[PDB]
Structure formats: structure tokens, C-alpha cells
Amino acid sequence: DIVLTQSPGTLSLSPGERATLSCRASQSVISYYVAWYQHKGGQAPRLLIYGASSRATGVPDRFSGSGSGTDFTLTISSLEPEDFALYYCQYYGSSPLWAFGQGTKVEIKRTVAAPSVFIFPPSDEQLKSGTASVVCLLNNFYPREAKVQWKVDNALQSGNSQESVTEQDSKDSTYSLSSTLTLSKADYEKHKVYACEVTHQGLSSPVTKSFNRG
Amino acid sequence: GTFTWTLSDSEGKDTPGGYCLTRWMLIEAELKCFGNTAVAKCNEKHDEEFCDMLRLFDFNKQAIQRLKAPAQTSIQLINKAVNALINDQLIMKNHLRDIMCIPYCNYSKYWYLNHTTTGRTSLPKCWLVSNGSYLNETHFSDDIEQQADNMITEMLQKEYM
Amino acid sequence: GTFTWTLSDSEGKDTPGGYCLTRWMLIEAELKCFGNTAVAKCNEKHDEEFCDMLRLFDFNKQAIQRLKAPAQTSIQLINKAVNALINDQLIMKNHLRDIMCIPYCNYSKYWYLNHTTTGRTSLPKCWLVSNGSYLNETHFSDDIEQQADNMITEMLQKEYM
Amino acid sequence: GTFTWTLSDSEGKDTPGGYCLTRWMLIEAELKCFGNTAVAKCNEKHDEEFCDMLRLFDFNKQAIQRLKAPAQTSIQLINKAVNALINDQLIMKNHLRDIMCIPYCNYSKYWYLNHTTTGRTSLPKCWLVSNGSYLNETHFSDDIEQQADNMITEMLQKEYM
Amino acid sequence: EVQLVQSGGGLVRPGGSLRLSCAAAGFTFKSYSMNWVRQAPGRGLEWVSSITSGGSKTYYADVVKGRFTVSRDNAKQSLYLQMNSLRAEDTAIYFCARSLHSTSQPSYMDVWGRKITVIVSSASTKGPSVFPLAPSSGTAALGCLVKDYFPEPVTVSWNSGALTSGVHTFPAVLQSSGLYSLSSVVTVPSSSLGTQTYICNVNHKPSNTKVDKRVEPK
Amino acid sequence: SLYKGVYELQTLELNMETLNMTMPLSCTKNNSHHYIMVGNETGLELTLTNTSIINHKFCNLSDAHKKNLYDHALMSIISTFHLSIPNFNQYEAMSCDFNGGKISVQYNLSHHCGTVANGVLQTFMRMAWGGSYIALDSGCGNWDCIMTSYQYLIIQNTTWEDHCQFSRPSPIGYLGLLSQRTRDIYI
Amino acid sequence: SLYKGVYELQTLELNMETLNMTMPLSCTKNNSHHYIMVGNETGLELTLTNTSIINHKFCNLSDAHKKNLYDHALMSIISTFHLSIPNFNQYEAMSCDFNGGKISVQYNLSHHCGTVANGVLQTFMRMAWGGSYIALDSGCGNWDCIMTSYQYLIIQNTTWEDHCQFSRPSPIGYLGLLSQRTRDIYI
């Protein structure tokens, strides 16, 4: 089956810069069947480039199509706030009939920001049910690449927590994360000290926020 | 100019008109015939690659037959009949298609619909190619649909006649 | 290219369109006219020898009329208009027919059907010739039948209109 | 030869087929589109000046798009595609018309009918000119009538279909 | 105007079927080919199935082969997609788009219909449980926890919708039990704690649940 | 005001200027000056004046081809003109100059009907199709007996400006002589 | 599997080899070797190699015509090639040799865009239409800026063998350049 490789998977720029989105195919495909799309999470995807080079109606002149053989490129001359979204390349004719790329993410490049870490103990109203939840808030940081580790009595726990990342803000252009550590009320009383270890690129040393039960 | 070669392979057939391709005109295939209802579009349409080959083969068939062989395979004849046999811009169009990375016709493979019972055949349209590889069948499925629907509309008119 | 000369002899006629041949355009014959229903096939069909002569005579009629006579019968004009008046491959086809001992059209004699009462005329098709002798009337009787039947089908449509 | 360029501007339209003219292709005018019912006559008729310009603009659109720009605007390409894009005798006809003081087409101004409510458009026929002045609207009013009546007959067939 | 009218979303248990529809608006439907396209949660774009104009040839992706049945009614100008024997991974948003594969023009999907929410899960409809998240001692952060609810979505506001600055309603995640859960937090000044009352206004449109939890520091 | 009470007469005028990158465009400024534009920065100047620009009667084309310094695009359209000229037997009127790629060809028109000046003027009317009748008297009157008051036809290269004053640009001119090429020429 | 439930998709591939007696057939063997077959015992060999076969820079065509020893059929297709080549002003790359009818023409391609090597390569792609993209890089990418890694184009006569390895024979090639003949050539 044909494999569409979109590079890079994450892209950081600013309005007015040149975006060079690539798309690699496993087989020497036909240029005439390559197409590019812009996907906004709120609505349906929009066709930008069809036939590798042709621009669809309503697509601004800044978008451009290029490529031949196995290397195809979508290039935006100068960026705009509306252009910051996801982009997909496609090819029709091989297996599967409609091949789709991975997903090139276009985000605004904010100056590096440090996450404001907060830890939340499980509420007593929740422990009455029979299950505890430990929330570790990471607020307003850049970039999105951040790692959260859970240490229970200075002992790491893996797989028992769930992360959640918000989208880049409209004004400050930062991200936020909320890793929720879920444990049983019987096992939450089995321990005493709980902490989440935050490691970010904009951190000189890994910050750890903790709390003692009771 | 405009092509003017008229082919005639009506001898010993159910209806006058129509052309047949001998098993020596097709690679790894037996002989195939096409009805007069189909070849009639060759006298009208100025843009069918398969019609230009029919006039080219019917010329090759008649030239070898009705003219004594030259001493050393003279090319003087075909150079003066080329404009009356094919279309010089139909091949020039496929050049530009190939030049613009668009699937073109290299005049080798042709496809056509053929009914499973009544045996009615369509006019063979050219199978396109780009970077030396034929298009998959799914690349132009809607073209077959438009061509398969033309069969139904053309079938309707005979009963209406 | 493709011929583009459009003739107009509609003045003082029952219907617009149609062309007439003066008694000086025909040898040992008076003037003959043909309806707009017939000459309309000259703008479409790319293979009628009689239509190429109509455009050639209507050019000769207009060139002598609308251009002051040259000093010594200049040929510069007709050489540049020949491709827009006739079909260079229609004459080339008749060469190959003559070359292959096949009855060809030497552009002199033409035949046509003409109703005995209503006076409807067909488009004059060319009378063929081989080894310098015209074909007898019986050589292409089935061609007249196909042409005489076209008259009935064309007659039917007017009432259907 | 015979022109063979096929244009395709069907993306994002109600029906496949048809061509649109951008506001940069027209002087002092916004963009105008024409239905597939109209542009279909461009693949058939060998005598429409507006169809030759459509193939010329669709070539200019595709040539700039699908071929990297030459070093100093090379003319080698258009010289070999001219016979497959336009008709060399259609322009030669307008020469002879201008030469014979007959109103000719200088390929600039075109007229067309456009319904006041349903928005159906005809194929733009060329606005003629003689001694450097366009014909008044009344010079060819009967041509519009024959063209406006064709709209009614073409409208009737869709309901009959 | 050229549009595609989508419809057919819903929730089903794994094993049940679901029909997707898509009507044609303002274009010759029988002239174009129809395709189905889905997007799994937090995943890339995927191709489901395709049926040519005139419905002569049908194609499917190896995943939904057998479970899915694409059909079209060129008389009604409508596209359909039956999803017999659905599974867990089939939950996604689905789209119907038209295409034309011909010699004349390249491959593209220009006209698209809006999203179609399909959720295939064995869990049942349950209201949310709102647990507070308060801090303890110049700005602090407090929030709510919307845990164990089904299905999506849930809207959360703060202080009757007046408080908007610094609010972060996090995307919901699906727990191992098959129940969604999210947290809505807001950054507030430390000087207002114990003085400005903070309440989160959670509304669960499924089951019509309206919970107002008071978040106060411990 | 409306045809058949339901239809409107609407018009459109093509903007030929956008075809400059693909094909040359022909337009005339006034009676004397006529232009062919090849691109957006290069052009050719056809002019009709009583003043001679080349006194010598030579045409070293072979040398110009060796020292390839001209633009091939402009050499194509100047070769198309001379090849389109029929009945060219008086090579004394052929005066050319290509010093360092600066192309310039002159035709001696001062020499009755069917002269060597006739075929040159006929080719000129087709070359600048849009508005060439201004250079001749009763242009539609004749075809073979074509004559002007001027005595020299000078074709020099020039830079691109908005010279299209009397007529708009048009490729209809140049595209017509491509078929007349190497025809009616004697051995 | 069947279209409209009543129709079948069937195909046919034409055997171009049978047209050999009437028209020439063009086919390519590999990257370097390309062929035009005229008959069943005579052919022509187009090859692209970095090795030169003609050191001298002459082309005695007039002598070759006097001592008529070549095949007129092969002289027609070699004249068709050079006449189809546009913008041929560098006659230094033109090196020919016709000793006793043994025909052989060489083009010096080692010399940027629009060079004398461009028009020769363009004519070559049309001559061996079936499978000429293998000799160039990104053949569909360009038309005017056409270039290869090799430095010489040698066209020698050869005997007939089953050289059609990469592509099948086809007259579509040769029949296309018959209209481009004597066009875009300068005086």
C-alpha cells in the first residue's frame, strides 16, 4: 500500500513567512492525481491544490502547488492567521484508492515560555464515591512538547494517568496541559506524598509540585 | 487540412460498413471487429486517436496490396498521405500533454465497452499513460460511466427509429 | 487547417441561404440552383468535393468583383487562400484513389437527385472516373438508393418540425 | 490539420464542463462564465472565433502554470502548438474579408445573449468591424434573432429530454 | 447553491448498524462520483468508501470491508452509507464529498458536507459528576472536574458566564471505563480567594443535566 | 430594448495583454510606428519613415549566426516576416545590421504594380494586423497593388513600453503568417 | 466487476510492427540506444554517448548528393530531423560523414537555457516518441530548458534487429515532425 509521508509533522512560523510543506510517496506516483487540502477542526476540509499544481476556486494566490515523481510540495508565500491549521496531501489511483498524508501542523512561533505548574488533590466529595483524581495543571507554555511524570512516594507511575492539551491561544499563542492521575480510594490512602514532575524545554531544571495527603 | 481517408471492410458482413482488426494487427490477441454504428463516429469526430490508427492500418493494407513493392522500401508515399490519413495536431496535443506532465495517449493501448450478451461494442478510446505507466482502471471510471451511458442512449434510438 | 469560406447567394430568394450556379459556370447547361437545406451540409461535411468547388467559385466571383484587376494576373492571392477555400487532403485522397486504380473524382462531373414535381434537389455528389472513363450509372446504384432514401428521411423531419 | 486542444474548467461548478473568464482576461469587466451547454459547440464547430481564443487562453493558463519559465521568453513552444490551438484559416478568412472591404472579425469584441432571469448564455459570437469601426447593433439584428431563436429551440429540448 | 446536506449521526452499541445519508443541492448528482471520509478522534484523515457515478463500481477500505455498504440513489440525488456490525474504533466524524475522475480533469474532492458525529460505544448515557479543584496558600488557579459522563459534549462556564479571562476548558478524554472526562480551570488573583465567589456552570445537553458547583479553597 | 422580451444583449472584450508570456502581441502606435511585444521587457519596432537608417546594401546573416548575440525569439519573428514575403527577387533592397546582437533590418521600398515593395507591405499588414490600414491608402481597395507614400521599412529592436496607442495588442497577427512561411518563395 | 451490470471493459493493443513496409517505426532499446526502422532489413541508430565518433567539423552534403550512394529513405528521415530542429545557428556542432553511402551525423551537445543543444534534444524526443524520457531528467518538467548528461548525439545507419526493448515500435514519432518541417529556421 502507498504510504504518504508529510514532513515536517510540526511547523513553527510567523505571519509573513514562507511555509514549505512536503509530501513523500512510497511509489513513483502520477503528478496529475496529487492534491492538497486545508483542514479546520470546526468544519469540513477545503480543497486547495488539485492536480499537484492547479489552485481551486476561492483559494488565495499565495498558495502554490509543486512536485514531481515522489516529492511534492505545498508552498505558502506569506502566512496569515487563517492559514495556521492542518494540511493533508493525497493521491488517487493506488491502494487504498484515496491515500492520505500524516498531518502537517502549522502553529505560531511564540517566544519560549515556562509552564505555570499547579497540583490539585482529590476532593473529599469525590473520595466519598470511591475513586480519587490528582490533577497537575500546566498553564501557558511554548512549545507543546512537555513531559509530565507522576511520582507516588518518590516512585514513578506509568499508564495510570491521562493527559489533555488545549489548542494554541488566539492572543498569547501558548498551550496548556492537564495530566489527571486516577487512583482508587483504597490505593490513594495506601500512600502519603504525591507529586507530578514537569520537564519542559523552557525549564532550566525539572520542576516538581507535590502535596501530602491530609 | 482535414483527413479524408475512408475505410471499407463491409464485404461478407451482416450490415455494410464497419472495420475488423486481424490477429496480426493486435499483439497477443485474436481478431476483433467493430460495428458500423461505432466506426461511423470515425468519419465525424476529429479527435479520436483510434480512428487515426484505423485509417493508418487500412492505408497500410491497401498500399501493400494495390502498389507493387518498391526497390528498397520507399518513404515518398507515406510522407504525402500522412495529412490525409491522420491528424497532425492530435499527436501534437499528446506531445503537449506529455510535456505538461498530463496523462497522454501513446497510441498503443485502447479500451472499449462490449456487452456481455448482445455483443455491442463502443468505439475504443485510448488508454492514457504518464511517466511510462498506464493509468489504473479507477483513474477514469467516470469516463467509462459517461461512455457506458452513451450506449444506453444509442440503444434507445434504434427502437425509436 | 480547416476551410472557413462562407458563401452567400440569398438575395432575391424564397429562403435565406442556398447557392446558384450561373449558365457560365456550367458547360452546355443553363443555370441551376440548390436549396439552403442542401448547401447547409457544405458548412459541416469535410469530405464533399462539390462543396470545395462552391467555395472556389464564390471566391472567384468575389475576388474579381471586390478587388481591382492586377497588372498581369497575379497568383499571390489564391496561393494564400487555397487552404481556407478547399481541402488539401480531399484532392490528395483522389490522387491516392487514382494511384491505387480505384475510381476517383476528377472534379468535373457531378450527379444529384431532383424530385419530378416538388423540385427538391440533393447535394451533388461527384461522378467518379477511372482510366479516363466515367463509371456507368449502374456502378453506384446503391449509392443513389442510400441518397434517395436520405431525401425521404429529410422530407419527414420538416413535417415533424 | 484540425485543432485538438480540450479545455477543462469544471472544478467547483454545478455541472462538469464549461469555461470561465477571469477579470484579468477581460478589459474593464469582471469575471464571466459560460455553461457547458454553450462551450460544447466549441469542440464541434470549426468556424467560431471565440472558441479559438478560449483554447488560446486555456493554453496560456496551462503553459505558464505547468512549465517553468524560460530564460528570456522563448517562442519555440507556441509556434509548434498554434495549429493545435486555433484555426489558421479562420484568421485567413478575416484577412480576405478585410481585404474585400467586408466586415471582418478583429478578435477583440464579442457579443452574446444572456437571459434576464434564468441566466442562460449563448456562445459569444464575434463583433465585426470595418475601416476601424465596429458595426452598430442594428447592422446584424436578424443574426441575433436567429441566435435568440436557437435559445428557445435549445431550451425546448431539455424539457423533451 | 452547490452544497451537500449531511445527516445520519448517532450513538450505537458495538454490533448495531447505522445509516449515513447525504443529499445533493444545486448540481447534477448523477454526473459526479461520491466518496466517504472519516476522521478518528485525535487521528489523521482517513478514506472509508467510494461509489462511482451511476453506481457501477464500489470500493472500500480494508478496515471497513464487509461492515460498510456504500450505495447511492441517482434518482433522489442522494448518497448513503450503511454501517452494519460497528466496532469501537469506528467512532469518528464522517464526511461526504463529491469527486470526478476523468481524462479531462484531475482527482479532487471540492464539494464537502458538514461533519457527521458517529459514536460506537457500549457505555450508556450518564450524567456528569462535578468535583471542585481548589488551591491552598500573585495569582492562583482553581477549577472544576467533569468526570464520568456520556456521551459528548458538555459546556462549562464560570460565574454565570461573566468570568471569561484566563479560563481553560480542557478537551475531554475517554477513560478506560468508556466514560468521558475533562477539567475546566481558570486563573484568578490570590487576593480574591475567600472573597470573590467562584462557581462553574456545567451543562450536559444529553440527559439535560445542569450542575452548579461552588469551588472554594481548603 | 430586449430581444424576444426575455433576452439581453451583453458584450465582452478580451484582454490580449495577458498572453505576452506565451505568444507575441502586435499593436500599432500611429501612422509610422508599429510594435510587436515579446514578453514584458523585450519588443520589436516596425516603423515606416522616409529617412534611411542603413546606407550599405549588405546582409551578413551568416556572421550574425556565428557570433550568436541576438535574441532567438526576435530572430524567429524577423525570419517569419521575410519568409512570409512572396516573390523576393530584389536582394538589393535587403539591408541588414546586427552589430553585437542589436538587430535592425531595412527594406528599400522606393522603386506599376507587383514590385518587390508590394510583398513587403502585404507581409507588414498581416504582421501588425490591429491597425495597419492607417499606413496605406484605401487599404481594403487592393491586395496585389499595395503601396504607401514612404520609402523605407525599418525594423529595430526596442524596450517594452505602453506603445499600444491606436490599437490593442493581438497575437492574431503573428499567428497568421506561421502557415504562409516558406511559401511563394523562388529557388 | 461489470459496468452498468451489462457491459464489460475490454482492451486491445495495436501491433505497430506490421506498418514497417509503409512507414518508419520508432522504438528505444535503453537509455543510450534508440532506433528508427525503415523496412525489415534497414534501420537507423540514434545513440547518446559521451564518446565522439567524428573529430572533424565539416559536413559535405553537396558532395554526398553528387555521389548518390545513400538510401533516399534514410536521407529523408535525417533531413526531417535537422529541418525540425529550431534555432540552428551554431553550425560548428554540425559534423557529418557519408563515406560511400554509410550515413552518420553527429551533434556536439557540450556547450543556461535555449542553447543549440536544446533544439536538438527537443527534436530527439519527438523522433523516438516511445520511451524518450529515459534519456533526460524530469522530461515532463520542462520543454525549452531541455538538457541531458551526455555530450554527443550520433545517428548512424544499422541493420535490422529486434532492438525494441524498452518500448514498442511506433510511427507516431516520425509522423509528427512532418508538419514542423522547415519552421522556426532562420535565414
Ligand SMILES: *[C@@H]1O[C@H](CO)[C@@H](O[C@@H]2O[C@H](CO)[C@@H](O[C@@H]3O[C@H](CO)[C@@H](O)[C@H](O[C@H]4O[C@H](CO)[C@@H](O)[C@H](O)[C@@H]4O)[C@@H]3O)[C@H](O)[C@H]2NC(C)=O)[C@H](O)[C@H]1NC(C)=O
Ligand atoms: C506506451 O506505454 C506503455 C507503458 O509505458 C509501453 O509499454 C511497455 O512496452 C514494453 C516494450 O514492449 C514492455 O516491455 C516488455 O517486457 C517484457 C517482460 O520483461 C519483455 O519480455 C519484452 O521484451 C521483448 O523485446 C525484447 C527486445 O525487442 C526481446 O529481446 C524479448 O525477447 C521480448 O520479445 C519487453 O521488454 C512493457 O511490458 C510494456 N508495459 C506495459 C505496462 O504494458 C508501450 O510500449 C508504449 N507504446 C509505444 C508505442 O512505445
Ligand SMILES: *[C@@H]1O[C@H](CO)[C@@H](O[C@@H]2O[C@H](CO)[C@@H](O[C@@H]3O[C@H](CO)[C@@H](O)[C@H](O[C@H]4O[C@H](CO)[C@@H](O)[C@H](O)[C@@H]4O)[C@@H]3O)[C@H](O)[C@H]2NC(C)=O)[C@H](O)[C@H]1NC(C)=O
Ligand atoms: C474528367 O474525366 C473525363 C473523362 O475522362 C474528362 O472528359 C472528357 O473531356 C474531353 C476534353 O474536353 C472531351 O473531349 C472532347 O471531345 C469532343 C468530341 O470529339 C471534342 O470536340 C472536344 O474538343 C474541344 O477542344 C478542342 C481543343 O480545345 C477544340 O479544338 C474543339 O473545337 C473542341 O472545342 C474535346 O476534345 C471528352 O469528350 C470528355 N469525355 C467524357 C466522357 O465526357 C474530363 O475532361 C475530366 N476532367 C478534367 C478537368 O480534365
Ligand SMILES: *[C@@H]1O[C@H](CO)[C@@H](O[C@@H]2O[C@H](CO)[C@@H](O[C@@H]3O[C@H](CO)[C@@H](O)[C@H](O[C@H]4O[C@H](CO)[C@@H](O)[C@H](O)[C@@H]4O)[C@@H]3O)[C@H](O)[C@H]2NC(C)=O)[C@H](O)[C@H]1NC(C)=O
Ligand atoms: C478592433 O477594432 C476596434 C475598433 O477599430 C479597436 O478598438 C479601439 O482600440 C483603441 C486602442 O485601445 C481605443 O483607443 C483608446 O482611446 C482611449 C480614449 O482616447 C485612450 O485613452 C486609449 O489609450 C490608452 O493607451 C495609450 C497608449 O497605450 C495610453 O497612453 C493611454 O493612457 C491609454 O491607456 C486608446 O488609445 C479605441 O477607443 C477603440 N475603439 C473602440 C470603438 O472600442 C480594437 O483595438 C481592435 N482590436 C485590436 C486587437 O486591435
Ligand SMILES: *[C@@H]1O[C@H](CO)[C@@H](O[C@@H]2O[C@H](CO)[C@@H](O[C@@H]3O[C@H](CO)[C@@H](O)[C@H](O[C@H]4O[C@H](CO)[C@@H](O)[C@H](O)[C@@H]4O)[C@@H]3O)[C@H](O)[C@H]2NC(C)=O)[C@H](O)[C@H]1NC(C)=O
Ligand atoms: C503578461 O502575462 C502575465 C501572465 O499572463 C501577466 O502577469 C500577471 O499580471 C497580473 C496583473 O498585473 C497579476 O495579477 C495580480 O495578482 C495579485 C496576486 O498575485 C493580485 O493581488 C492583483 O490584484 C490587485 O490588482 C488588480 C489590478 O491588476 C486589482 O484589480 C485588484 O483589486 C488588486 O488590487 C493582480 O490581480 C498576476 O499575478 C500576474 N501573473 C503572475 C503569474 O504573477 C502580466 O501582467 C502580463 N504583462 C503585462 C504587461 O500585462
Ligand SMILES: *[C@@H]1O[C@H](CO)[C@@H](O[C@@H]2O[C@H](CO)[C@@H](O[C@@H]3O[C@H](CO)[C@@H](O)[C@H](O[C@H]4O[C@H](CO)[C@@H](O)[C@H](O)[C@@H]4O)[C@@H]3O)[C@H](O)[C@H]2NC(C)=O)[C@H](O)[C@H]1NC(C)=O
Ligand atoms: C512488415 O510488414 C509486413 C506486412 O505488413 C509483415 O509481413 C507479414 O508478416 C506476417 C507474419 O510474419 C505474415 O503472416 C503469415 O502469413 C502466412 C500465410 O501467408 C500464415 O500462414 C502465417 O501464419 C502462421 O504464423 C502465425 C504467426 O505469425 C501463427 O499464429 C499461425 O497460426 C501460422 O502458424 C502468418 O500469419 C504475412 O504473410 C506477411 N505479409 C505478406 C504480404 O507476406 C512483416 O512481418 C512486417 N515486418 C516485421 C519485422 O514484422
Ligand SMILES: *[C@@H]1O[C@H](CO[C@@H]2O[C@@H](C)[C@@H](O)[C@@H](O)[C@@H]2O)[C@@H](O[C@@H]2O[C@H](CO)[C@@H](O[C@@H]3O[C@H](CO)[C@@H](O)[C@H](O)[C@@H]3O)[C@H](O)[C@H]2NC(C)=O)[C@H](O)[C@H]1NC(C)=O
Ligand atoms: C494501481 O494499482 C496497483 C494495484 O493494483 C490493483 O490492486 C487491486 C486493489 C485492484 O484494484 C486491482 O484491479 C489493481 O490491479 C498499485 O500497485 C501496488 O503498489 C504498491 C506500492 O508499490 C504495493 O504495495 C506494496 O505491497 C507489498 C506486498 O505486496 C509490500 O511489501 C510493500 O511494502 C508495499 O506495501 C502493492 O502491493 C501494489 N499492488 C499490487 C496488486 O501489486 C499501483 O500503485 C496503482 N498505481 C499505479 C500508477 O500503478
Ligand SMILES: *[C@@H]1O[C@H](CO)[C@@H](O[C@@H]2O[C@H](CO)[C@@H](O[C@@H]3O[C@H](CO)[C@@H](O)[C@H](O)[C@@H]3O)[C@H](O)[C@H]2NC(C)=O)[C@H](O)[C@H]1NC(C)=O
Ligand atoms: C464481445 O464479447 C463477445 C462475447 O462476450 C465476443 O464474442 C465472441 O468472440 C469470439 C472471438 O471473436 C467468437 O469466437 C469464434 O467462434 C466461432 C464459432 O462461432 C469460431 O469459428 C471462431 O474461430 C472463434 O473461435 C465467439 O463466437 C463470440 N461469441 C459470441 C456469442 O458472439 C466478441 O468478440 C466481443 N467483441 C470484441 C470486439 O471483442
Ligand SMILES: *[C@@H]1O[C@H](CO)[C@@H](O[C@@H]2O[C@H](CO)[C@@H](O[C@@H]3O[C@H](CO)[C@@H](O)[C@H](O)[C@@H]3O)[C@H](O)[C@H]2NC(C)=O)[C@H](O)[C@H]1NC(C)=O
Ligand atoms: C429539377 O427539376 C425541375 C423540373 O423537373 C426544374 O425546374 C424547372 O427549371 C427550369 C430551368 O431552371 C425552369 O425554367 C424557367 O422557367 C421560367 C418561367 O417559369 C423562365 O422565365 C426561365 O427563363 C426558365 O426557362 C422551370 O420553370 C422549372 N420548372 C418548375 C416546375 O419549377 C429544376 O430546375 C430542376 N432542378 C435543378 C437543380 O436542375
Ligand SMILES: *[C@@H]1O[C@H](CO)[C@@H](O[C@@H]2O[C@H](CO)[C@@H](O[C@@H]3O[C@H](CO)[C@@H](O)[C@H](O)[C@@H]3O)[C@H](O)[C@H]2NC(C)=O)[C@H](O)[C@H]1NC(C)=O
Ligand atoms: C447574465 O445575467 C445575470 C443577471 O442578469 C448575471 O448574474 C449576476 O452576475 C454577477 C456577476 O457575475 C453576480 O454577482 C456576484 O454576486 C455574488 C453573490 O451572489 C458575489 O459574491 C460576487 O462577488 C458577485 O458580486 C450576480 O450574483 C449574478 N446574479 C444572478 C441572479 O445570478 C450573469 O453574470 C450574466 N452572465 C454573464 C455571462 O455575464
Ligand SMILES: *[C@@H]1O[C@H](CO)[C@@H](O[C@@H]2O[C@H](CO)[C@@H](O)[C@H](O)[C@H]2NC(C)=O)[C@H](O)[C@H]1NC(C)=O
Ligand atoms: C508616432 O509616435 C512616435 C512616438 O511618439 C513619434 O516619434 C517621435 O518623433 C519625434 C519627432 O521626430 C521625435 O523627437 C521622437 O524622438 C520620436 N519618438 C520615438 C519613440 O521614436 C512619431 O513621430 C509619431 N508619428 C506620427 C506620424 O505621428
Ligand SMILES: *[C@@H]1O[C@H](CO)[C@@H](O[C@@H]2O[C@H](CO)[C@@H](O)[C@H](O)[C@H]2NC(C)=O)[C@H](O)[C@H]1NC(C)=O
Ligand atoms: C560581411 O562579412 C564579409 C566577410 O568578413 C565582409 O567582407 C570583407 O569585405 C572587405 C571590403 O569589401 C574586404 O576587404 C574583405 O577582404 C572581405 N572579407 C572577406 C573574408 O572576404 C563584409 O564587408 C561584411 N559586411 C558587413 C556589412 O559587415
Ligand SMILES: *[C@@H]1O[C@H](CO)[C@@H](O[C@@H]2O[C@H](CO)[C@@H](O)[C@H](O)[C@H]2NC(C)=O)[C@H](O)[C@H]1NC(C)=O
Ligand atoms: C537592442 O538590443 C541591444 C542589445 O540588447 C541594446 O543595446 C544595449 O544598449 C544600451 C543603451 O544603448 C547599452 O547600455 C547596453 O550596454 C547595450 N547592450 C548590449 C548587449 O549591447 C539596444 O539598446 C536595443 N535597442 C534599443 C532601441 O533599446
Ligand SMILES: *[C@@H]1O[C@H](CO)[C@@H](O[C@@H]2O[C@H](CO)[C@@H](O)[C@H](O)[C@H]2NC(C)=O)[C@H](O)[C@H]1NC(C)=O
Ligand atoms: C544499451 O544497449 C546496447 C546494446 O545492447 C549497449 O551497447 C553495447 O555496449 C557494450 C559495452 O560498451 C558493447 O560491448 C557492445 O558492443 C554494445 N552493443 C551495441 C549494439 O552497441 C549499450 O551499452 C546499452 N546502454 C545502456 C546505458 O545500458
Ligand SMILES: *[C@@H]1O[C@H](CO)[C@@H](O[C@@H]2O[C@H](CO)[C@@H](O)[C@H](O)[C@H]2NC(C)=O)[C@H](O)[C@H]1NC(C)=O
Ligand atoms: C523482407 O521482406 C521482403 C519482402 O517480403 C523479403 O523478400 C524476399 O526475398 C527473397 C530472398 O531474396 C526472395 O526470394 C523473395 O522473392 C522476396 N520477396 C518478394 C515479394 O519479392 C525479405 O526476405 C525480407 N527480409 C527479411 C530479413 O525478413
Ligand SMILES: *[C@@H]1O[C@H](CO)[C@@H](O[C@@H]2O[C@H](CO)[C@@H](O)[C@H](O)[C@H]2NC(C)=O)[C@H](O)[C@H]1NC(C)=O
Ligand atoms: C569537402 O569537399 C571539399 C572540396 O573537395 C574539401 O576541400 C578541400 O580541402 C583541402 C584541405 O583543406 C584543400 O587542400 C582542397 O583544396 C579543398 N578542395 C577544394 C576543391 O577546395 C573538403 O576537405 C571536404 N571535406 C571533407 C570532410 O571531406
Ligand SMILES: *[C@@H]1O[C@H](CO)[C@@H](O[C@@H]2O[C@H](CO)[C@@H](O)[C@H](O)[C@H]2NC(C)=O)[C@H](O)[C@H]1NC(C)=O
Ligand atoms: C551502413 O551502410 C553501409 C552501406 O550500405 C554498410 O556498409 C557495408 O558494410 C559491410 C560490413 O562492414 C560491408 O561488407 C559492405 O561491403 C558495406 N557496403 C557498402 C556499400 O559499403 C554499413 O555496414 C552500414 N552500417 C552498419 C552499422 O551496418
